[PDB]
Design an enzyme around this catalytic site. Structure first.
Site, PDB file in Angstrom:
ATOM      1  N   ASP A  47       0.785  -1.203   0.000  1.00  0.00           N
ATOM      2  CA  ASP A  47       0.000   0.000   0.000  1.00  0.00           C
ATOM      3  C   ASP A  47       0.836   1.281   0.000  1.00  0.00           C
ATOM      4  OD1 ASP A  47       0.909   0.010   2.835  1.00  0.00           O
ATOM      5  OD2 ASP A  47      -0.935  -0.807   3.454  1.00  0.00           O
ATOM      6  N   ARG A  80       0.613   6.766   0.263  1.00  0.00           N
ATOM      7  CA  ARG A  80      -0.019   5.687   0.953  1.00  0.00           C
ATOM      8  C   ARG A  80      -1.429   5.615   0.320  1.00  0.00           C
ATOM      9  NH1 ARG A  80      -2.717   2.280   3.296  1.00  0.00           N
ATOM     10  NH2 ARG A  80      -2.354   1.454   5.415  1.00  0.00           N
ATOM     11  N   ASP A 106      -5.677  -1.466   3.859  1.00  0.00           N
ATOM     12  CA  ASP A 106      -4.572  -1.916   4.638  1.00  0.00           C
ATOM     13  C   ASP A 106      -4.106  -3.268   4.115  1.00  0.00           C
ATOM     14  OD1 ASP A 106      -2.707  -1.573   6.655  1.00  0.00           O
ATOM     15  OD2 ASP A 106      -4.190  -1.819   8.250  1.00  0.00           O
ATOM     16  N   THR A 107      -2.854  -3.371   3.687  1.00  0.00           N
ATOM     17  CA  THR A 107      -2.358  -4.662   3.313  1.00  0.00           C
ATOM     18  C   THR A 107      -1.585  -5.252   4.498  1.00  0.00           C
ATOM     19  OG1 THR A 107      -0.428  -3.603   2.194  1.00  0.00           O
ATOM     20  CG2 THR A 107      -2.351  -4.196   0.875  1.00  0.00           C
ATOM     21  N   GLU A 134       1.516  -6.593   6.411  1.00  0.00           N
ATOM     22  CA  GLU A 134       2.840  -6.012   6.508  1.00  0.00           C
ATOM     23  C   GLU A 134       3.908  -7.053   6.345  1.00  0.00           C
ATOM     24  OE1 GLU A 134       4.096  -2.324   7.047  1.00  0.00           O
ATOM     25  OE2 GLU A 134       5.054  -3.712   5.716  1.00  0.00           O
ATOM     26  N   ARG A 171       3.209  11.403   4.005  1.00  0.00           N
ATOM     27  CA  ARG A 171       2.958  10.616   2.804  1.00  0.00           C
ATOM     28  C   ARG A 171       1.703  11.207   2.120  1.00  0.00           C
ATOM     29  NH1 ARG A 171       2.440   4.590   5.443  1.00  0.00           N
ATOM     30  NH2 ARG A 171       0.853   5.845   6.593  1.00  0.00           N
TER      31      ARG A 171
HETATM   32  C1  LIG Z   1      -4.295   5.218   5.187  1.00  0.00           C
HETATM   33  C2  LIG Z   1      -4.020   6.236   6.314  1.00  0.00           C
HETATM   34  C3  LIG Z   1      -3.078   5.988   7.257  1.00  0.00           C
HETATM   35  N1  LIG Z   1      -2.782   6.924   8.238  1.00  0.00           N
HETATM   36  C4  LIG Z   1      -1.847   6.645   9.341  1.00  0.00           C
HETATM   37  C5  LIG Z   1      -2.628   5.833  10.361  1.00  0.00           C
HETATM   38  C6  LIG Z   1      -1.534   5.009  10.972  1.00  0.00           C
HETATM   39  O1  LIG Z   1      -0.887   5.744  12.009  1.00  0.00           O
HETATM   40  P1  LIG Z   1       0.041   5.018  13.109  1.00  0.00           P
HETATM   41  O2  LIG Z   1       1.344   4.757  12.468  1.00  0.00           O
HETATM   42  O3  LIG Z   1      -0.233   5.816  14.308  1.00  0.00           O
HETATM   43  O4  LIG Z   1      -0.577   3.571  13.409  1.00  0.00           O
HETATM   44  C7  LIG Z   1      -0.568   4.758   9.847  1.00  0.00           C
HETATM   45  C8  LIG Z   1      -0.929   3.473   9.151  1.00  0.00           C
HETATM   46  O5  LIG Z   1      -0.134   3.385   8.000  1.00  0.00           O
HETATM   47  P2  LIG Z   1       0.441   1.994   7.523  1.00  0.00           P
HETATM   48  O6  LIG Z   1      -0.697   1.057   7.397  1.00  0.00           O
HETATM   49  O7  LIG Z   1       1.346   2.249   6.382  1.00  0.00           O
HETATM   50  O8  LIG Z   1       1.309   1.546   8.781  1.00  0.00           O
HETATM   51  O9  LIG Z   1      -0.709   5.869   8.946  1.00  0.00           O
HETATM   52  C9  LIG Z   1      -3.430   8.145   8.275  1.00  0.00           C
HETATM   53  O10 LIG Z   1      -3.188   9.014   9.097  1.00  0.00           O
HETATM   54  N2  LIG Z   1      -4.379   8.372   7.323  1.00  0.00           N
HETATM   55  C10 LIG Z   1      -4.740   7.498   6.331  1.00  0.00           C
HETATM   56  O11 LIG Z   1      -5.652   7.823   5.582  1.00  0.00           O
HETATM   57 CO   LIG Z   2      -0.340  -1.234   7.427  1.00  0.00          CO
END
Ligand SMILES: Cc1cn([C@H]2C[C@H](OP(=O)(O)O)[C@@H](COP(=O)(O)O)O2)c(=O)[nH]c1=O
Ligand SMILES: [Co+2]
Length: 136
Positions: A16, A30, A35-36, A38, A82
């Protein structure tokens, strides 16, 4: 309304997350609403279907002749800087393609960045029903 804009692949990172050149800047993006599993993050491990979701995204963006970025109507970047968008490879949305294969779940639904939620929920229910990958 939403609009597709060009971008150029630099490198796929995993299921993702993809690094793209967008209006001359390298940015990592992103994928909105999915959510894929990890691959590498020691705080979860390598989940089942992580290598497979990453291979699917890699292949789909590296073989595309045209990549487009479509931002939604709220925040364009998350707290890690991102870009948050729907990515299309030759007119096919990668976020939907992974969910339709059962290699991603609909996750992180932060209003108002949710225009394609229903479309994605529809593909996820069809993949669950077909017992595909994450659902098998
Ligand atoms: C997809 C997405 C992720 N995120 C944040 C939530 C998660 O925060 P935390 O790192 O606090 O858990 C993280 C998840 O991304 P990943 O799934 O790449 O880890 O990125 C956002 O803020 N907004 C979004 O729309
Ligand atoms: Co993730």
């Amino acid at each position: 309304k939403l609009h597709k804009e060009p971008a150029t692949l630099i490198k796929a990172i995993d299921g993702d997350t993809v690094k793209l050149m967008y209006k001359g800047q390298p940015m990592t993006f992103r994928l909105l609403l999915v959510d894929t599993p990890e691959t590498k993050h020691p705080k979860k491990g390598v989940e089942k279907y992580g290598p497979e979701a990453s291979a699917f995204t890699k292949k789909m963006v590296e073989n595309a002749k045209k990549i487009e970025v479509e931002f939604d109507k709220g925040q364009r970047t998350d707290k890690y800087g991102r870009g948050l968008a729907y990515i299309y490879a030759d007119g096919k949305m990668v976020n939907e393609a992974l969910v339709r294969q059962g290699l991603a779940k609909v996750a992180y639904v932060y209003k108002p960045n949710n225009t394609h939620e229903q479309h994605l929920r529809k593909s996820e229910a069809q993949a669950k029903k077909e017992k595909l990958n994450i659902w098998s």
